[PDB]
Amino acid sequence: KHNDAVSEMGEQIDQLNKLKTKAEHDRTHVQNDLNNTRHALDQMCREK
Amino acid sequence: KHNDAVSEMGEQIDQLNKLKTKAEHDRTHVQNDLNNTRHALDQMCREK
């Protein structure tokens, strides 16, 4: 019953680790374009 | 010794979960700067 409890919590925490990194990627994905579009902004304002 | 293992990974269940609630809370907060910035480029792009 220990080795069940390690595993059923273990089958919980491993897919939860997928839910973090999936949410972690969507954080860095939206920040990267903000890192791009701000760099797109000040380059365009340099031209004006 | 079986029971404290539950508490330590349950703390890992918690701290990974509050990290997700932290990270998803950026995903709107970072997005507020995006609609701030993407509005600003479209103002300047017509102005150029």
Coordinates of N, CA and C in Angstrom, one line a residue:
Chain A
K1 N 0.8 -1.2 0.0 CA 0.0 0.0 0.0 C 0.9 1.3 0.0
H2 N 2.1 1.2 0.5 CA 3.1 2.2 0.3 C 3.4 2.3 -1.2
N3 N 3.8 1.2 -1.8 CA 4.3 1.2 -3.2 C 3.1 1.4 -4.2
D4 N 1.9 1.3 -3.8 CA 0.8 1.8 -4.6 C 0.8 3.3 -4.4
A5 N 0.9 3.8 -3.2 CA 0.7 5.3 -2.9 C 1.8 6.1 -3.5
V6 N 3.1 5.5 -3.6 CA 4.1 6.2 -4.3 C 3.8 6.3 -5.8
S7 N 3.2 5.3 -6.3 CA 3.0 5.2 -7.8 C 1.8 6.0 -8.2
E8 N 0.7 6.0 -7.4 CA -0.5 6.7 -7.8 C -0.3 8.2 -7.6
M9 N 0.5 8.6 -6.6 CA 1.0 9.9 -6.6 C 2.0 10.2 -7.7
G10 N 2.8 9.2 -8.0 CA 3.8 9.3 -9.1 C 3.1 9.4 -10.4
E11 N 2.0 8.7 -10.7 CA 1.3 9.0 -11.9 C 0.5 10.3 -11.9
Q12 N 0.4 10.9 -10.7 CA -0.1 12.3 -10.7 C 0.9 13.3 -11.0
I13 N 2.1 13.2 -10.4 CA 3.0 14.3 -10.4 C 3.7 14.4 -11.7
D14 N 3.8 13.3 -12.5 CA 4.5 13.3 -13.7 C 3.7 14.0 -14.8
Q15 N 2.4 13.8 -14.8 CA 1.6 14.5 -15.8 C 1.3 16.0 -15.3
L16 N 1.4 16.2 -14.0 CA 1.3 17.6 -13.5 C 2.5 18.3 -14.0
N17 N 3.7 17.7 -14.0 CA 4.9 18.3 -14.5 C 4.8 18.6 -16.0
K18 N 3.9 17.9 -16.7 CA 3.6 18.3 -18.1 C 2.8 19.6 -18.1
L19 N 1.9 19.7 -17.1 CA 0.9 20.9 -17.1 C 1.7 22.1 -16.7
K20 N 2.8 22.0 -16.0 CA 3.6 23.2 -15.7 C 4.3 23.7 -16.9
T21 N 5.1 22.8 -17.5 CA 5.9 23.2 -18.6 C 5.1 23.6 -19.8
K22 N 3.9 23.1 -20.0 CA 3.0 23.5 -21.1 C 2.6 25.0 -20.7
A23 N 2.2 25.2 -19.5 CA 1.9 26.6 -19.1 C 3.2 27.5 -19.1
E24 N 4.3 26.8 -18.8 CA 5.6 27.6 -18.8 C 6.0 28.0 -20.2
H25 N 5.7 27.1 -21.2 CA 6.0 27.5 -22.6 C 5.1 28.6 -23.1
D26 N 3.9 28.6 -22.7 CA 3.0 29.6 -23.2 C 3.3 31.0 -22.5
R27 N 3.9 30.9 -21.4 CA 4.4 32.2 -20.8 C 5.6 32.7 -21.6
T28 N 6.6 31.9 -21.9 CA 7.7 32.3 -22.7 C 7.4 32.6 -24.1
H29 N 6.4 31.9 -24.6 CA 6.0 32.1 -26.0 C 5.4 33.5 -26.2
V30 N 4.6 34.0 -25.3 CA 4.0 35.3 -25.5 C 5.0 36.4 -25.1
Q31 N 6.0 36.1 -24.2 CA 7.0 37.1 -23.9 C 8.0 37.3 -25.0
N32 N 8.2 36.2 -25.8 CA 9.2 36.3 -26.8 C 8.8 37.2 -27.9
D33 N 7.5 37.2 -28.3 CA 7.0 38.1 -29.3 C 7.0 39.5 -28.7
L34 N 6.7 39.7 -27.4 CA 6.9 41.0 -26.8 C 8.3 41.4 -26.7
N35 N 9.2 40.4 -26.6 CA 10.6 40.8 -26.8 C 10.9 41.1 -28.3
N36 N 10.1 40.6 -29.2 CA 10.3 40.9 -30.6 C 9.7 42.2 -31.0
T37 N 8.4 42.3 -30.6 CA 7.6 43.5 -31.1 C 8.0 44.8 -30.5
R38 N 8.5 44.7 -29.2 CA 9.1 45.9 -28.7 C 10.4 46.3 -29.4
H39 N 11.2 45.2 -29.8 CA 12.3 45.4 -30.6 C 11.9 45.8 -32.0
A40 N 10.7 45.4 -32.4 CA 10.2 45.9 -33.7 C 9.7 47.3 -33.6
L41 N 9.3 47.7 -32.3 CA 8.8 49.1 -32.1 C 9.9 50.1 -32.2
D42 N 10.9 50.0 -31.4 CA 12.0 51.0 -31.3 C 12.8 51.1 -32.6
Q43 N 12.8 50.0 -33.4 CA 13.4 50.1 -34.7 C 12.6 50.9 -35.6
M44 N 11.3 50.7 -35.5 CA 10.4 51.5 -36.4 C 10.3 53.0 -36.0
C45 N 10.5 53.2 -34.7 CA 10.4 54.6 -34.2 C 11.8 55.3 -34.5
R46 N 12.8 54.5 -34.7 CA 14.1 55.0 -35.1 C 14.0 55.6 -36.6
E47 N 13.1 55.0 -37.4 CA 13.0 55.4 -38.8 C 12.2 56.7 -38.8
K48 N 11.2 56.9 -38.0 CA 10.4 58.1 -38.0 C 11.2 59.3 -37.6
Chain B
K1 N 7.9 7.1 8.4 CA 8.8 7.1 7.3 C 8.1 6.9 6.0
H2 N 7.0 6.1 6.0 CA 6.1 6.1 4.9 C 5.3 7.4 4.8
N3 N 5.0 8.0 6.0 CA 4.0 9.1 6.0 C 4.7 10.4 5.7
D4 N 5.9 10.6 6.1 CA 6.6 11.9 5.8 C 6.9 12.0 4.3
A5 N 7.1 10.9 3.6 CA 7.2 10.9 2.2 C 6.0 11.4 1.5
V6 N 4.8 11.2 2.0 CA 3.6 11.8 1.5 C 3.6 13.3 1.7
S7 N 4.1 13.7 2.8 CA 4.1 15.1 3.1 C 5.1 15.9 2.3
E8 N 6.2 15.3 2.0 CA 7.2 16.0 1.2 C 6.8 16.1 -0.3
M9 N 6.3 15.0 -0.8 CA 5.8 15.1 -2.2 C 4.5 15.9 -2.3
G10 N 3.7 15.8 -1.3 CA 2.5 16.7 -1.2 C 2.9 18.1 -1.2
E11 N 4.0 18.5 -0.5 CA 4.5 19.8 -0.6 C 5.0 20.1 -2.0
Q12 N 5.6 19.1 -2.7 CA 6.0 19.3 -4.1 C 4.7 19.3 -4.9
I13 N 3.7 18.7 -4.5 CA 2.4 18.8 -5.3 C 1.9 20.2 -5.1
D14 N 2.1 20.8 -3.9 CA 1.6 22.2 -3.7 C 2.5 23.2 -4.4
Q15 N 3.8 23.1 -4.2 CA 4.7 24.2 -4.7 C 4.8 24.2 -6.2
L16 N 4.6 23.0 -6.9 CA 4.5 23.0 -8.3 C 3.1 23.6 -8.7
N17 N 2.1 23.4 -7.9 CA 0.8 23.9 -8.3 C 0.7 25.4 -8.1
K18 N 1.3 26.0 -7.0 CA 1.3 27.4 -6.9 C 2.2 28.1 -7.8
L19 N 3.2 27.4 -8.4 CA 4.0 27.9 -9.5 C 3.1 28.0 -10.7
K20 N 2.2 27.1 -11.0 CA 1.3 27.2 -12.1 C 0.4 28.4 -12.0
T21 N -0.2 28.5 -10.8 CA -1.0 29.6 -10.5 C -0.3 31.0 -10.6
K22 N 1.0 30.9 -10.3 CA 1.9 32.1 -10.5 C 2.0 32.3 -12.0
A23 N 2.4 31.3 -12.7 CA 2.8 31.5 -14.1 C 1.6 31.8 -15.0
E24 N 0.5 31.2 -14.8 CA -0.7 31.6 -15.5 C -1.2 33.0 -15.2
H25 N -0.8 33.5 -14.0 CA -1.1 34.9 -13.6 C -0.3 35.9 -14.4
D26 N 0.9 35.4 -14.9 CA 1.7 36.3 -15.7 C 1.1 36.4 -17.1
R27 N 0.5 35.3 -17.6 CA 0.0 35.1 -19.0 C -1.0 36.1 -19.3
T28 N -1.8 36.6 -18.4 CA -2.7 37.8 -18.6 C -1.9 39.0 -18.4
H29 N -1.0 39.1 -17.4 CA -0.4 40.3 -17.0 C 0.7 40.7 -18.0
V30 N 1.4 39.7 -18.6 CA 2.3 40.0 -19.7 C 1.5 40.4 -20.9
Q31 N 0.3 39.8 -21.1 CA -0.5 40.1 -22.3 C -1.0 41.5 -22.3
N32 N -1.2 42.1 -21.1 CA -1.6 43.5 -21.0 C -0.6 44.5 -21.5
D33 N 0.7 44.1 -21.5 CA 1.7 44.9 -22.1 C 1.7 44.7 -23.6
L34 N 1.3 43.5 -24.1 CA 1.3 43.3 -25.5 C 0.2 44.1 -26.2
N35 N -1.0 44.1 -25.7 CA -2.0 45.0 -26.3 C -1.7 46.5 -26.0
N36 N -0.9 46.7 -25.0 CA -0.3 48.1 -24.9 C 0.6 48.4 -26.0
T37 N 1.5 47.5 -26.4 CA 2.5 47.8 -27.3 C 2.0 47.6 -28.7
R38 N 1.2 46.6 -29.0 CA 0.7 46.4 -30.4 C -0.3 47.5 -30.8
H39 N -0.9 48.1 -29.8 CA -1.7 49.4 -30.1 C -0.7 50.5 -30.5
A40 N 0.5 50.5 -29.9 CA 1.4 51.7 -30.0 C 2.0 51.6 -31.4
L41 N 2.3 50.4 -31.9 CA 3.0 50.3 -33.2 C 2.0 50.7 -34.3
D42 N 0.7 50.3 -34.2 CA -0.2 50.6 -35.2 C -0.6 52.1 -35.3
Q43 N -0.4 52.8 -34.2 CA -0.5 54.3 -34.2 C 0.7 54.9 -35.0
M44 N 1.9 54.4 -34.7 CA 3.1 55.0 -35.3 C 3.2 54.6 -36.8
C45 N 2.7 53.4 -37.1 CA 2.9 52.9 -38.5 C 2.1 53.7 -39.5
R46 N 0.9 54.1 -39.0 CA 0.1 55.1 -39.9 C 0.8 56.4 -39.9
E47 N 1.5 56.8 -38.8 CA 2.0 58.1 -38.7 C 3.3 58.3 -39.5
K48 N 4.0 57.2 -39.7 CA 5.2 57.2 -40.6 C 4.8 57.5 -42.0

